[PDB]
Amino acid sequence: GIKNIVYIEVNDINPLNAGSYIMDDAPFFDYVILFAANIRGVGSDATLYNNPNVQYILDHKDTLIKPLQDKGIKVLLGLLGDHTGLGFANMNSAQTEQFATAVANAVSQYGLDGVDFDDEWAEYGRNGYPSGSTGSFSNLITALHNKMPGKTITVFNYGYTSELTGVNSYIDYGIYAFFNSPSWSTGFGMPNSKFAPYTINLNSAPSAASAQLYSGQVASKGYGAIGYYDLRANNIVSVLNGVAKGAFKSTCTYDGNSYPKNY
Ligand SMILES: [Mg+2]
């Protein structure tokens, strides 16, 4: 069936809010991305950096991640550039393996269900790192695939993703990077069934009817996912119920839980 994939800006929003939405006695959301841990170049090293918000969530996996997983939601660690000049796309071979290993170790250590790649904000070329692509982004996907074959990889369709066609068998879903209007196409050779061509911004939300009509079109054309970006702690059930009607011939309800972020 169609998968609902939501990115939570964990600098702002407690991720438990994704579990407050119910459709058919199950969570409306199928995948939650904790957006985001960072790739950072530190000298010759490619490093995985968790900011204080991300690290807090990982340190509290049993109370901020596991409650979602216990409901059946798959929780992914988002991966994002962070202004160092090193990103997913300009690593050498050693750096690629180093970063793949750091990511796999975090997925294992924190009991996560996989990762999402958003090749954004790396600022390619700073600090003496290569200004252009080395082809590492495909090699990074392959390396993670081999390390965690049973875990999910999603790709937010931004940055050097045009390079990923050859490794797209290792990517579960790609997600359109612009909001509130479909683009009836996919990135990096993905089939309809592995792509979200429509991504709703849940902060600057469209009308429920807009979501209902577009999500009905997504379903009719056989796409495999709908994207959601920036779920907040307000009750946005009207929009999700629109999708429940349009794409799932169902309804979405809210359990009342607005979880604050006080860490
Ligand atoms: Mg509105």
Author numbering: 44 to 79, 80A, 81 to 201, 202A, 203 to 225, 226A, 227 to 306
Provide passages from the article that reported this PDB entry.
The genomes of Bacteroidales contain genes encoding glycan-degrading apparatuses that typically co-localize in discrete clusters known as polysaccharide utilization loci (PULs). B. thetaiotaomicron contains almost 300 different GHs belonging to 60 different GH families, and secretes at least six mannosyl-glycoprotein endo-β-N-acetylglucosaminidases (ENGases, endoglycosidase hereafter) that hydrolyze the chitobiose core of asparagine-linked, or N-linked, glycans (EC 3.2.1.96). Here, we discover an ENGase from the GH18 family in B. thetaiotaomicron, BT1285, encoded in a distinct PUL with its own repertoire of proteins for catabolism of the same HM N-glycan substrate as that of BT3987. Altogether, our data suggest that human gut microbes employ evolutionary strategies to express distinct ENGases in order to optimally metabolize the same N-glycan substrate in the gastroinstestinal tract.
